[PDB]
Structure 1
Amino acid sequence: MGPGFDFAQAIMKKNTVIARTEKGEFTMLGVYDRVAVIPTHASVGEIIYINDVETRVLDACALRDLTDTNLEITIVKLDRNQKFRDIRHFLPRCEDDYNDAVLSVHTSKFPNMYIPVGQVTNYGFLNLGGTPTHRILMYNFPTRAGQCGGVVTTTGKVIGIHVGGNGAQGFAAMLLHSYFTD
C-alpha cells in the first residue's frame, strides 16, 4: 500500500523460501549465496525441505553472543542449485530502535502476509520459552503461531526475524551485518 510494504514485498519475492523441519513450516530468509537464517527453535537437522524439495544441510550454526547467551538465530548453508540475491547491504551494523516496521510471512498457512507492526523497541533481554535470549526487538502486535521466521523490515533495512510472542507483543531476533561476513 506504501513504500514500507514495497520494500517488504521486494525482499519476500526474491529472498524467502518455505523451510520445513520436524518442528513445522517456517518463513526462511536467504541472505547471500546458499546461506539463509531461521529461528533456532526450528531444530534444523542434516536434511530440510525447501519449497517441498529434500535438501542437504551443508552447515548449521546456532548463534550465541560472547556472554554465551542464546540469540535464537540459526545460520544454515543449503545444498541448493541456486544462489540468493545478496541483501547483506540492507542489514544494520548496530543494535537500534526503529519506526514503522513491517512483519512479512510466506507459508502454506499464511501466503503473502504483510503486517504493519509500527514502532520497534531494542528490548534486549527476554526469557523466550524459558531460554534467556539477547538482542530482542519488540513490537506491539498480537502475533500468532505460524509467523516464526517472518521477516521484519523498515524502508531500506532488513532488521530481524520473528521468534515469539506473548499474545499482545511480538519479538524478533536482530539481524546484524557482522553475522554474515565471509
Structure 2
Amino acid sequence: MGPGFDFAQAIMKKNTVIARTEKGEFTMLGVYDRVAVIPTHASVGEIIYINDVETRVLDACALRDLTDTNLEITIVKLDRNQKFRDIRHFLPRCEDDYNDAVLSVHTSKFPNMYIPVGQVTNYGFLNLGGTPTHRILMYNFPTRAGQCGGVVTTTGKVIGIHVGGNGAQGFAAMLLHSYFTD
C-alpha cells in the first residue's frame, strides 16, 4: 500500500521459499547463491522440503555469539539447482533500532501476508522459550504461530527473521552483513 510494503514484496517475490522440517512449515529467506536462513528451533536435518521438493542439506550452522549465547539463526546451504538473487547489500552492518518495519510471511496457511509492526527496538537479551538469546529485535504486534521465519524489513534494509512472541510483542533475530561474508 506504500513504500514499506513495496520493499517487503520485492524481497518476498524473489528471496523466499517455503521450508518444511519435522517441526512444521517456515518462511525461509534466501540470502545469496544456495544459502538461506531459518530459526534454529526449526531443527534442520540432513533433508528438508523446499516448496514441497525433497532437498539435501549440504551444510547447516546454528549461530552463537562469541559469549557462546544462542542467536536463534541457522544458516543453511541447500542442494538446489538455482541461486537466490544476492541481497547481502540490504543487510545492516551493526545492531540498531528502526522505525516503520514490515513483517512478511509466506506459507501454505498464510500466503502473501504483510504486517506493519511499527517501531523496532534493539531489545538485546531475551529468554526465548527457556533459552538465553542475544541480538533480539522487538515490535509491539500480537504475532501468532505460523509467522516464524517471517522477514522483517524497513525501506531498503532486511533486518531480521521472526523467532517468537509473548501474545502482545513479537521478537526477531537480527541479520547482520558479517554473517554472510565469503
Q: What displacement does 1:15 show?
A: 0.0
C-alpha distance in structure 2 between counterparts of 1:154 and 1:12, whole Å: 13
- RMSD after superposition: 0.1
Q: What displacement does 1:25 show?
A: 0.0
C-alpha distance in structure 1 between counterparts of 2:42 and 2:13, whole Å: 22
Q: What displacement does 1:83 show?
A: 0.1
C-alpha distance in structure 2 between counterparts of 1:141 and 1:70, whole Å: 24
Give the match's secondary structure for 2:54: strand
Q: What displacement does 1:142 show?
A: 0.1
C-alpha distance in structure 1 between counterparts of 2:109 and 2:121, whole Å: 28
Deviations 1:14-46 (A, max 9, x none): 000000000000000000000000000000000
Indicate the residue corresponding to 2:32 in structure 1.
Answer: 32
C-alpha distance in structure 2 between counterparts of 1:181 and 1:57, whole Å: 20
C-alpha distance in structure 2 between counterparts of 1:14 and 1:83, whole Å: 10
Q: What displacement does 1:145 show?
A: 0.2
C-alpha distance in structure 2 between counterparts of 1:118 and 1:137, whole Å: 12
Q: What displacement does 1:129 show?
A: 0.1
C-alpha distance in structure 1 between counterparts of 2:108 and 2:49, whole Å: 13
C-alpha distance in structure 1 between counterparts of 2:109 and 2:178, whole Å: 32
Q: Normalising by structure 1, what TM-score?
A: 1.00
Indicate the residue corresponding to 1:84 in structure 2.
Answer: 84
Deviations 1:114-149 (A, max 9, x none): 000000000000000000000000000000000000
Give the match's secondary structure for 1:4: helix
Structure 1, unmatched stretches of 5+, are none
Q: Normalising by structure 2, what TM-score?
A: 1.00
C-alpha distance in structure 1 between counterparts of 2:170 and 2:109, whole Å: 19
C-alpha distance in structure 2 between counterparts of 1:153 and 1:40, whole Å: 20
C-alpha distance in structure 1 between counterparts of 2:122 and 2:21, whole Å: 29
C-alpha distance in structure 1 between counterparts of 2:140 and 2:149, whole Å: 17
C-alpha distance in structure 1 between counterparts of 2:54 and 2:110, whole Å: 22
Indicate the residue corresponding to 1:66 in structure 2.
Answer: 66
Deviations 1:30-79 (A, max 9, x none): 00000000000000000000000000000000000000000000000000
C-alpha distance in structure 2 between counterparts of 1:82 and 1:135, whole Å: 31
Q: Percent identity?
A: 100
Give the match's secondary structure for 2:5: helix
Count of aligned positions: 182
Structure 2, unmatched stretches of 5+, are none
